[model samples]
Target: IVGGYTCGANTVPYQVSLNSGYHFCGGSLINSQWVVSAAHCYKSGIQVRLGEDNINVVEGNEQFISASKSIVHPSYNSNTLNNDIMLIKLKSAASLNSRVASISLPTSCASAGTQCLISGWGNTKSSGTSYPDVLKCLKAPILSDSSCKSAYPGQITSNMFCAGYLEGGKDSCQGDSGGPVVCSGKLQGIVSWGSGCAQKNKPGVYTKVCNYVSWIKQTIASN
Candidate 1:
């Protein structure tokens, strides 16, 4: 398993919060107009807090951006957990700064076996409770399509991609569903689902960002 700093490890720019008090698990600023995250992250009264060390502390310098609208993918299915991605349009554009800038989405995903980064504010261990304020990250390699299909023979679909260790000890658990899966610095995927958090032989599944590029571009353009 790959290890990294906590949510308080180093300040990340361009993330939002839900008014419900749930901090950002995964988010990205696209252009000056939009913020992208997972659909499941949406809830009424959610707030977006950018450039801060702790969501609860509110001590450091940060910006709270209110969402004008929340748009989830039309095909999103909570039961199946398919198409579980979404975007939030901030009421106004944020000032671009080094501590608050956007990250670009990937046009293509890495081939199988490529290493990727999964970051979130979820539980570190399978049975652990959610971290109150710390964000964590792990590195897992992309699984081959066949391997993924065989592993989740009943659930894996073409629209999804798989990653994580085969041993099943480490993974993104509850509260991590909408996080980012970065590969070689490109925003390649969004955390969606898996057999269970950190289960052996079962890896985390993510929405393939590239597969939905057209939809994303059109959605942003229309909005």
Candidate 2:
């Protein structure tokens, strides 16, 4: 996160720390039993922590649970990173309270140029490797699909969306994958991958949540 700051607890209960041994990625609690994350972040020993403000200390409000099973999207492309989303089914359901809850999904596909927010525990620098204890957040403006296409050329896919600065200096970097990108208090995207931290004209790439609404609903029902 190039331009980010510390955030308080209870502000984003739905946001959880997806740990594959250590804090590997971020996830969002859409329901008590499910955590949505990035396909690229999937692996063994994965778990999640809810109602957590800091990872270094175990707060009283924190609820730690294992991922009973994880389902990566069938179309997820490891090379191009298309369809880079996944769902982790928790072993036990989370108990919702003041410090833990789920977030609302997008009512409809958010358009380009929407003002959105991102929250995570990602690195502060691209070259440097320093993780924060507390959660961090920043406001990122959604860039047009066409504009993103122009910069990425054949690399950008329809399943992916873009957000962040045009000139640079503000973005979600490593360790922030699978975190929430909330627009209008609703989940609009998931931090997937990006070129570099706050690179000029290279916005943060995300898995466009709206395009996977039906798949999400159906997967929930079947699983």
Candidate 3:
């Protein structure tokens, strides 16, 4: 994340690292056993790291849980990156703690100009393999649908939204996909895609979490 600050220990408690052997994506714990992430991050043998601040250290507060089931949105489109969201049911329920907890889903859609907090352990640089050990965070305002479409013509969908500086200095990048975009403490977005890490005329695109609240609940209930 460029132009962001280092998140202190347990600062972003709901943040989780989606991994195989190493961190590949970020996620949000929506409940004791359910994690919300981007559909594009789906893979077999995923391990979810909860309460993680630094990726390299063995923090005593961390919980390493395997995914029992990973369900991608049925309408997810790889080409358009629409409905880019997923839900992973943990093999076992995570014991909530000060640093390991769930984030509430958004009760309503976020409007344009709503400042949201994005956190991840993704690349600190725009053009390199500069993944950070400590989690990084930045606040970017949600852009209007019209503005978002102008930024990425023919790419913006109703299920997606854009956030970040228009001039471009901060954003979620590769390895940050599936990370949480919390607005006023509600999980409103998931890091999905963008033109570049943090480039001019291109803001970070995200899965609009509010639109999937029912789908999320129904999936958990039926399964």
Q: What is the lDDT of residue 161 in candidate 1?
A: 85
- Report the lDDT of model 3 for residue 13: 91
Q: Ten residues in a row with the worst lDDT in model 1?
A: 1-10
Candidate 2 Cα misplacement greater than 4 A, ranges: none
**Candidate 1 lDDT score at position 68:** 86
Candidate 1 similarity to native, TM-score: 0.89
TM-score of each: 0.89, 0.96, 0.98
How many clashes in each structure?
A: 10, 0, 0
The local distance difference test score of each candidate is 0.72, 0.87, 0.90
lDDT per residue as tens, model 1, 68-89? 8889999888877778789888
Which pairs in model 3 have colliding backbones?
none
Worst 10 residues of 2 by lDDT: 1-10
Q: Best candidate per lDDT, number?
A: 3
- Between candidates 2 and 3, name the one with more favorable lDDT: 3
lDDT of 2 by residue, 1-223 (tens): 6687787766777889987667889999999999898899889888788998888788789999998989999899899999999989999999999889898887698888789989998888866777788899998788988878876889988888899887877889684989999898888899998887887887889899988888887898788
TM-score order, best first, reads 3, 2, 1
Report the CA-based lDDT of candidate 3 relative to the real structure. 0.90
